[PDB]
């Protein structure tokens, strides 16, 4: 039940007016898709395939640990969790408080924009402050940008400094692109959600 | 069909006004959601890539075995099965009882806010016990709150003390960091709804 | 399809008053619930990393086999689903027989308490047959009530007595006591449902 | 989309009064039950840990093949596969035929119980003509009625006579019993509908 | 998806009278029933245990690829691709038009007989022209009509002629017969529907 | 939710009179079973059995990346992700502003065929756009139009010039053929509606 249930109540009757309202749900749908791809494709190789130059036990393991603390599709998994947390949780807090006001005083629209049309705008605040949480350890927890084909480990258990190979570190680079880029993208479109909601206050 | 049934009777129609009554439900939500990233993706290599240096045969199984008893992920699994546990218990004590009492004197609402408010404030007891019954042995059980790169595992058939490496005991850790977390979190919106029926009786 | 059109059918309109007509199976959900997660998880593990230290050929898989016959996540499958049979074969039974009689007498109640709710009975004699069946075997098949960390196999083409060493013999007994433990529980209330039948006649 | 959809056409409206109605379909499900837990289980390693004591290049493949031409969960397999097939071309030509010529000669019963209580009696005799033509290769094609441990190999390019041992062949045939004996249980009730359009004509 | 949907526009409301209508689409559903069961299960094992008895490491490698360039369960997969197009094709060619020129002349079946009895003519010549295509290149591509127990194989960087193995080469010759046998009796009704449009015109 | 779901708003009510409408949409099926039988079959090999004729540890990991950046199945994929982006925006930009419009104006087709027939057209210029961009790059990137069964490869930490070998590379092509052969066909159905709508404006 992944994706197709986000969108019964995440891609709501009739919020807003600025063509930014889809265009940012269609990408991240295309940004699941791309991750529903990478991950059970390209990372299964990343411990497996990553190999050290060095017949000393203890270090690949900790070759690999030392330098991919949270593997990058489980960030890229973690990104879509969490900024998909405020997507889902506002539709929640409308399809909850909507259904309850209706049939509570109909046997016996102020606070619709009011209570929804708040936390909504909290919501897209929210939502660009995660895709900008990670976006920057995206950044700053991997060494620059992108991979390199190998490493030079001095995990512990290593005989002084050995060298570590990785698994296709383009392919895996090309997508951190992609899942990089469009993390940027996902964020302007958020910002202009947010600046929008700044301009008429 | 794991998540989208166990809302249409446990999202149910119109209990409580707390604003932490959907907040708790979004996060047993996010909370599998965590979890079916975890398990299937970093825990595979949890015996495999686990090495111990020595050549003795018995040693290495039983040096995981004396050391990850109940892994990790079937704990967190247990977790969200025990604490899922009184949400669909309940959830089941009302589609049933509700339906029963009604189809019942039509041909021939003190019991229901008797019955199940009732059975529900033992629920939140319940839920509020299993969080915290195993956010209890997941600290206890395994030595401190995180996992080391390497252990010192003195399993009967390995010669003497020998050593032997865990395969991304930080990204291990990340997620017992969030799991164990959101594990608080979802014990305190359980504890606020527990203190809410202790306020007003 | 597996679980949510079972209870389609098994958790019916309206067949008594006891409060384990739920209770059961709740737990019954609960149970493969537990078993779908020890499975595909805890069980491939078994023959991999089952190790005899020797190096004569026939032995490892003679010790696997003379050791471990019908392997625990696949009894606990077996008790699943011959304990499940009764409940859906019942639920077969009424669905059909109640559809029959109800379109051939309309064109052209003594009878739905008296086929269905004695077929019903005899439908929990045999859920307590199979739970106790099992459960039995589980017990009686297995030496003792849990794994040893290594067995001593005697299989045949073995040098003499070998050692061999299982894989988390521990996780492995964890997930025989639950299932174990529950497959009591579920009799408790299978014979208090045939207890019922019997009180009341 | 196995199993729940078979039945929509496979368990009809209103076709017979025997009580072997339903059993036989109960069975057919139970069937590909106990089979959807054998196969992915106990048969991945039939290949894998399939070992032969011979350092001959060729010998292990050729001692499979020679000794598993059609590995039992395939045969298992087909035959739920054509055993199903009068049950699914059956409640085909019924939808079909029954859709026709009622919305035919609408606009502008003798052959009801004509047209497809006739095709439905040759379909019995087909269901136990499959039922037994496997039933019957699975007990000789296969060495007898079960497997032994270790299995001597003539296979060609193997040095004269060498052993070789198969995995698990006891929870192997533990699951060769069950499916072969609701293969002569399945065969009864199938006869028994047989017998009775022999009775009355 | 996969099954279910392409008969809900290819199980159509009432096309022709002839019997062998719904019988090649019951094959159609049995041929992928088949094929279902042999790729994950069968074919795995084409390329790891394809043993070739050299050290020369080109070799095994180029021995599979010369000699297994389209795998059979990609064939047989194709063959269902293609031969599944026409069906599907003629599906949304009905259901496209059908629906078209009735919504839009209902407020501003001479040719619901022409243009679509027409394509389906074309179609019908089209599925045996794919069911025939493929049936030639799995009788000409691949070395008679079955696979060897073992094959010399002169794959480029071999040391002169060397052996290789298959795996359950007879297993994977059974199901090269069925679907080969059911590709030919595909073939008949798909021409006999090509015939009973040739003989009325 | 694969598949089904982006037809029911991707193949809409009724949008253009050119044959062409449903062709490309049945081959954009079609060309994602073709990948999704290819992906998970062929591709899993790639780096597995690509074998480097050298005992120099980087090499083979550097030789499959220098030499397979981003690996065919995941180009095929993320062709078939952009070309998929126009389809499902378009539907989407319509399934919001046509019910946006008349649910707002009902209460309190000039630009119906002027938003939406526009940034259709335009749509139909990004489809080729992407389809022409990666057909491009899977021409350019991939040396030559296949490729060989083994390479020499550079690679750096490898002495000197070494060998390696990929698996099935005929296989891989084959593969590599249609999908290009269907990636150039979806070109012109895709440029001859930029035609349709260059023609009559």
Redesign the interface.
């Known amino acids: ?5 986000q969108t019964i109540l995440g891609g709501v009757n ?1 919020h807003s007016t600025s063509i930014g ?3 940012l749900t ?1 990408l991240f ?2 940004r699941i ?2 991750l529903v ?3 059970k ?2 990372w299964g ?1 990343e ?1 497996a ?1 990553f ?1 050290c ?1 060095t017949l000393q ?2 270090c ?3 070759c ?3 330098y ?4 990058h ?2 960030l890229w ?2 990104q879509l ?1 969490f900024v998909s ?1 405020p997507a ?2 506002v539709a ?2 409308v399809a ?1 408080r909507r ?2 006001k209706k ?2 005083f109909i046997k016996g629209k102020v606070r619709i924009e009011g209570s929804l049309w708040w936390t909504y705008t909290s919501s897209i605040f929210f939502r660009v402050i995660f895709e900008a949480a990670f976006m920057y350890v995206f950044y700053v927890m991997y060494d620059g940008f992108s991979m390199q ?2 490493v030079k480990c001095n995990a ?2 290593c005989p002084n400094t050995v ?1 570590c ?7 895996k680079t ?2 951190t692109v ?1 899942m990089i880029a469009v993390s940027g993208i996902c964020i302007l479109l958020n910002v202009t959600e947010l600046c929008y909601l700044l301009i008429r206050y």
């Open positions: 039940d992944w994706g197709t249930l009739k309202k889809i265009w269609v749908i295309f898709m791309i791809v990478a991950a494709e390209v190789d411990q395939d190999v130059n036990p203890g690949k393991n900790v690999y640990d030392h991919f603390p949270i593997s599709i489980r998994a973690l969790i947390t889902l949780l929640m807090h909850y259904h309850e049939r509570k084909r190998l512990w258990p060298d190979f990785v698994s296709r570190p383009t392919e090309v997508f992609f």
